[PDB]
Amino acid sequence: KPLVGTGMERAVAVDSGVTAVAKRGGVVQYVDASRIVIKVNEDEMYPGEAGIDIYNLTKYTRSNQNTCINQMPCVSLGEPVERGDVLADGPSTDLGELALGQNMRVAFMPWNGYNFEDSILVSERVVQEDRFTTIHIQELACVSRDTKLGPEEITADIPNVGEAALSKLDESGIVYIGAEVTGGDILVGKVTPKGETQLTPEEKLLRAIFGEKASDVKDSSLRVPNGVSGTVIDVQVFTRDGVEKDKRA
Amino acid sequence: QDVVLGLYYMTRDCVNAKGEGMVLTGPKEAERLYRSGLASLHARVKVRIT
Amino acid sequence: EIKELLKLGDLPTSGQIRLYDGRTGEQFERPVTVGYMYMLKLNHLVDDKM
Amino acid sequence: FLKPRLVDIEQVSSTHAKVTLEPLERGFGHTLGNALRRILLSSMPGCAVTEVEIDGVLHEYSTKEGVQEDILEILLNLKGLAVRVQGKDEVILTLNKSGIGPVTAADITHDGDVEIVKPQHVICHLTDENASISMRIKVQRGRGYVPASTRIHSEEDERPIGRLLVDACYSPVERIAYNVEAARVEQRTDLDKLVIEMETNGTIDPEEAIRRAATILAEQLEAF
Amino acid sequence: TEFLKPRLVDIEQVSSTHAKVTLEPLERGFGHTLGNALRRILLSSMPGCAVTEVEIDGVLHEYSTKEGVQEDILEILLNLKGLAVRVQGKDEVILTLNKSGIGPVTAADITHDGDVEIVKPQHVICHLTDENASISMRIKVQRGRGYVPASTRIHLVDACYSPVERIAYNVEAARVEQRTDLDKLVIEMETNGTIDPEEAIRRAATILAEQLEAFVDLEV
Amino acid sequence: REEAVVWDILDEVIREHPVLLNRAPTLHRLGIQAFEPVLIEGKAIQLHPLV
């Protein structure tokens, strides 16, 4: 939250849809990280259909900027709530105010040139406290297309990969939910037909020595971009209306 | 910038401080005088130099 | 008002205090301003740019 | 050539204390005190939580039904759970609980080498009459700061995906400060004291720490 | 929780009285503590002997003029300070400047005593102006475990004990294999020629070790 | 594989082999300068203050 403020941060946090504002005031029957159930007062409440407002909180999901957006309950089990009060905080909002960052202990003084122009010199306490840590949500997609040579398969059967490679994929070829991945890991196995290599001399000779059945299928599989490393929080599968859904889907 | 504030703060003189008006054999024991806290970084002093 | 609130602290009017180098353990000449500055991490992350 | 030695080590809280060294020669309280502050803050034992396998959960980014703490936050709470061991370099604690109410650090299963310094420490709360959370809290022991990330090179079939690695906090020491005041021992010309008022989570004793600090300090002197 | 100990890989030493010695690899944070501590000790506490005082054969004062020498008496006291004195079991020795003539009195121009060693015959004590010139005086040494100024001898010559002329430590990153960032501690020191720098370091942090002898156990 | 050996080889290929550094608004010729590469942990380039 800001240690030093104006008094507008509240208005910003609330007026922006990121927070969760109680439609009607009352007592919280139920508080869960997933959802919040509030029992309405009789004065605010309409005569029929009786009683409660249930707010389903948005959980970890992709934002437009590939950042994360996650709501947390700011209230407690069995607590009085006023109408128009924050029932939850969006990302970068604290207790109904607006927190865009973190306030910290800062000293103004030249330190050994390590802050030479505007350059900032930060302690280890900060990187360890994980306070300036940030969570990214990246949406990767794998496309099974139709080429004149044949349809592309999402199958987990991938030419030229070890057991360590095919491990992280289920039987169908899609990575398990929650499995941590880094650059090069196969998220979705994809194979596309390319028949008849038209191999040459010594290559041929080589295949003759080692006896390999070099495949009629090229590897198109979607793998994690180089250098980016994260955990899979979700998987979706879209299918043409009328094509048979694969095992995983 | 930082560097010039460094050399400027190094070489500037105040009117009075620790080590004012003493005499030293050379720069070596001048630095040696300063680092140990006996003589101020900036004080008017006669020193032998080559 | 700020200084007054600082009186309600126990902390100086100057907003500056004595600081010691974590390396040599010796003090720093002059007081240095220390406080709490709300700081933002923009997303220019170096593992995007590189 | 008087060598120094300690004197009353004054405990104040379960958190911190003031340790004192009487016989210090000219300017030696700084040359000692700071060099001690350094090794104290940097190199020191610790048993910070590492691997945590929770109940129905594949990863830290979900929400367990029946607890208002996101899994990630629960992990962050476990990272701040202070414990001490005796004869083990790694111990796996079994945490169980259910029913509406706060789950503290005293709800685990006691073990031979387990000592919980903060039984009030909040792991996560519990919002519904039947919701149950079982977790294997794998606490190991080491030095410095080992983030969850550098933990994977070795890899080697960490396949149980229910196992969430967390960043290693290992260090007793929070804040170490030293003040050298002139200590007049009854007869001597001018001698100084050393008051090192340190700060800890309670998982390390003042004499233990201040011993091992100087230990390592002179241990580096082995060049000669 | 096993620990990382270096042993000096290289001593790169210029001439004799000068030395630059590198110690790697260290643990992060250790370069500055070792370097600083060893520096603070290397500077202000080191056993050694030079000149606490000299009687003036010419006059009674530090302010006067000698017949046959242009140097002010304080000027010559300076030179005396820069004379390297290594004394044996004799605790306090005393020499004489006896010589006279048409040219400067060096450190080879001083009387030769039993347990006295001058490292530099080359040293300039004072010049000799023309002809006969009255110059010879006596010089008493003194011992110290530290540095004692001239004004400090309360009940005058600045007493320079510690053989160290200069001490500096450079901390730079050290690379070991799968270890990411370490300390590489480079000490650089000049001496007055009495004790060589290489052993000077050794006694310097032997002092440190002895101050720590009241604490630890195990490794040894 | 980023096998452990190759870093030592890269130390070799880097030594005497300068790299060119350039900034966006190149105005005078000094807008490009050649330096000697020093291997550094991290994704950021370290540029001498005097330059």
CSV table of N, CA, C and O in Angstrom, one decimal, chain A residues 155-171 173-176 179-182 184-190 219 221-223, chain D residues 155:
chain,number,residue,atom,x,y,z
A,155,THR,N,-0.7,-36.1,-31.0
A,155,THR,CA,-0.3,-37.4,-30.3
A,155,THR,C,1.0,-37.2,-29.6
A,155,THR,O,1.8,-36.4,-29.9
A,156,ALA,N,1.1,-38.0,-28.5
A,156,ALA,CA,2.3,-38.0,-27.7
A,156,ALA,C,3.4,-38.8,-28.3
A,156,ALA,O,4.5,-38.9,-27.7
A,157,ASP,N,3.2,-39.3,-29.5
A,157,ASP,CA,4.2,-40.1,-30.1
A,157,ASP,C,5.0,-39.1,-31.0
A,157,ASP,O,4.5,-38.6,-32.0
A,158,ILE,N,6.2,-38.8,-30.5
A,158,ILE,CA,7.0,-37.8,-31.2
A,158,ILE,C,8.3,-38.5,-31.7
A,158,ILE,O,9.0,-39.1,-30.9
A,159,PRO,N,8.6,-38.4,-33.0
A,159,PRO,CA,9.9,-38.8,-33.5
A,159,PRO,C,11.0,-38.2,-32.8
A,159,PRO,O,11.0,-37.0,-32.5
A,160,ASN,N,12.1,-39.0,-32.5
A,160,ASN,CA,13.3,-38.4,-31.9
A,160,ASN,C,13.2,-37.7,-30.5
A,160,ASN,O,13.6,-36.5,-30.4
A,161,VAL,N,12.7,-38.4,-29.5
A,161,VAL,CA,12.7,-37.8,-28.1
A,161,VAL,C,12.9,-38.9,-27.1
A,161,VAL,O,12.4,-40.0,-27.2
A,162,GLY,N,13.6,-38.6,-26.0
A,162,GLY,CA,13.9,-39.6,-25.0
A,162,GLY,C,12.7,-39.7,-24.1
A,162,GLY,O,11.7,-39.0,-24.2
A,163,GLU,N,12.8,-40.7,-23.1
A,163,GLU,CA,11.7,-40.9,-22.2
A,163,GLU,C,11.5,-39.7,-21.3
A,163,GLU,O,10.4,-39.5,-20.7
A,164,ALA,N,12.6,-38.9,-21.1
A,164,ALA,CA,12.5,-37.7,-20.3
A,164,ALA,C,11.7,-36.7,-20.9
A,164,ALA,O,11.0,-35.8,-20.3
A,165,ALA,N,11.6,-36.7,-22.3
A,165,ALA,CA,10.9,-35.7,-23.0
A,165,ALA,C,9.4,-36.0,-23.1
A,165,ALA,O,8.5,-35.1,-22.9
A,166,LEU,N,9.1,-37.3,-23.3
A,166,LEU,CA,7.7,-37.7,-23.4
A,166,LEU,C,7.0,-37.9,-22.0
A,166,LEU,O,5.8,-38.2,-21.9
A,167,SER,N,7.8,-37.8,-20.9
A,167,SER,CA,7.3,-38.0,-19.6
A,167,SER,C,6.3,-36.9,-19.2
A,167,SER,O,5.3,-37.2,-18.6
A,168,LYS,N,6.7,-35.7,-19.4
A,168,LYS,CA,5.9,-34.5,-19.0
A,168,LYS,C,4.6,-34.3,-19.7
A,168,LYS,O,3.8,-33.5,-19.4
A,169,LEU,N,4.4,-35.1,-20.7
A,169,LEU,CA,3.1,-35.2,-21.5
A,169,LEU,C,2.3,-36.4,-21.1
A,169,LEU,O,2.9,-37.4,-20.8
A,170,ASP,N,1.0,-36.2,-21.1
A,170,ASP,CA,0.1,-37.4,-20.8
A,170,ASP,C,0.1,-38.3,-22.1
A,170,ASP,O,0.8,-38.0,-23.0
A,171,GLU,N,-0.7,-39.3,-22.0
A,171,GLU,CA,-0.7,-40.3,-23.1
A,171,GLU,C,-1.1,-39.6,-24.4
A,171,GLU,O,-0.8,-40.1,-25.5
A,173,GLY,N,-0.5,-36.4,-25.3
A,173,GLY,CA,0.4,-35.4,-25.9
A,173,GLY,C,0.4,-34.0,-25.3
A,173,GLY,O,1.1,-33.1,-25.8
A,174,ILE,N,-0.5,-33.8,-24.3
A,174,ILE,CA,-0.5,-32.5,-23.7
A,174,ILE,C,0.0,-32.5,-22.2
A,174,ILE,O,-0.2,-33.5,-21.5
A,175,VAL,N,0.8,-31.5,-21.9
A,175,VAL,CA,1.4,-31.4,-20.6
A,175,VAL,C,0.4,-31.4,-19.4
A,175,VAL,O,-0.7,-30.9,-19.6
A,176,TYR,N,0.8,-32.0,-18.3
A,176,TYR,CA,-0.1,-32.0,-17.1
A,176,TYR,C,-0.2,-30.7,-16.4
A,176,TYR,O,0.7,-29.8,-16.5
A,179,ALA,N,2.6,-28.9,-13.7
A,179,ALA,CA,3.9,-29.3,-14.0
A,179,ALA,C,4.8,-28.1,-14.4
A,179,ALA,O,4.5,-27.3,-15.3
A,180,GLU,N,5.9,-27.9,-13.6
A,180,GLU,CA,6.8,-26.7,-13.9
A,180,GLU,C,7.6,-27.0,-15.1
A,180,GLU,O,8.0,-28.2,-15.4
A,181,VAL,N,7.7,-26.0,-16.0
A,181,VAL,CA,8.5,-26.2,-17.2
A,181,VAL,C,9.4,-25.0,-17.5
A,181,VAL,O,9.3,-23.9,-17.0
A,182,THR,N,10.5,-25.3,-18.3
A,182,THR,CA,11.4,-24.4,-18.7
A,182,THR,C,11.6,-24.4,-20.2
A,182,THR,O,10.9,-25.2,-20.9
A,184,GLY,N,12.4,-25.3,-23.9
A,184,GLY,CA,12.7,-26.5,-24.6
A,184,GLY,C,11.8,-27.7,-24.2
A,184,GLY,O,11.7,-28.6,-24.9
A,185,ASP,N,11.1,-27.6,-23.0
A,185,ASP,CA,10.2,-28.6,-22.6
A,185,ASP,C,9.0,-28.6,-23.6
A,185,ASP,O,8.6,-27.6,-24.0
A,186,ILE,N,8.5,-29.8,-23.8
A,186,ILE,CA,7.4,-30.0,-24.7
A,186,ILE,C,6.1,-29.8,-24.0
A,186,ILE,O,5.7,-30.6,-23.1
A,187,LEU,N,5.4,-28.7,-24.4
A,187,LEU,CA,4.1,-28.4,-23.8
A,187,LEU,C,3.0,-29.3,-24.5
A,187,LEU,O,2.2,-29.9,-23.8
A,188,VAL,N,3.0,-29.3,-25.8
A,188,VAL,CA,2.1,-30.0,-26.6
A,188,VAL,C,2.8,-30.7,-27.7
A,188,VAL,O,3.4,-30.1,-28.6
A,189,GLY,N,2.7,-32.1,-27.7
A,189,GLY,CA,3.3,-32.8,-28.8
A,189,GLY,C,2.5,-32.6,-30.1
A,189,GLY,O,1.2,-32.8,-30.1
A,190,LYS,N,3.1,-32.3,-31.1
A,190,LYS,CA,2.5,-32.1,-32.4
A,190,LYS,C,3.4,-32.7,-33.5
A,190,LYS,O,4.6,-32.4,-33.6
A,219,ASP,N,8.5,-33.1,-36.7
A,219,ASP,CA,8.1,-32.7,-35.3
A,219,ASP,C,7.7,-31.2,-35.3
A,219,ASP,O,8.6,-30.4,-35.3
A,221,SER,N,5.9,-29.9,-32.7
A,221,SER,CA,5.3,-29.7,-31.3
A,221,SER,C,5.6,-28.4,-30.7
A,221,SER,O,6.7,-27.8,-30.9
A,222,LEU,N,4.7,-27.9,-29.9
A,222,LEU,CA,4.8,-26.6,-29.2
A,222,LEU,C,5.6,-26.8,-28.0
A,222,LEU,O,5.3,-27.6,-27.1
A,223,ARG,N,6.8,-26.1,-27.9
A,223,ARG,CA,7.6,-26.2,-26.8
A,223,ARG,C,7.9,-24.8,-26.2
A,223,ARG,O,7.8,-23.8,-26.9
D,155,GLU,N,17.9,-32.0,-10.4
D,155,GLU,CA,16.7,-32.5,-10.9
D,155,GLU,C,16.5,-33.9,-10.4
D,155,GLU,O,16.2,-34.1,-9.2
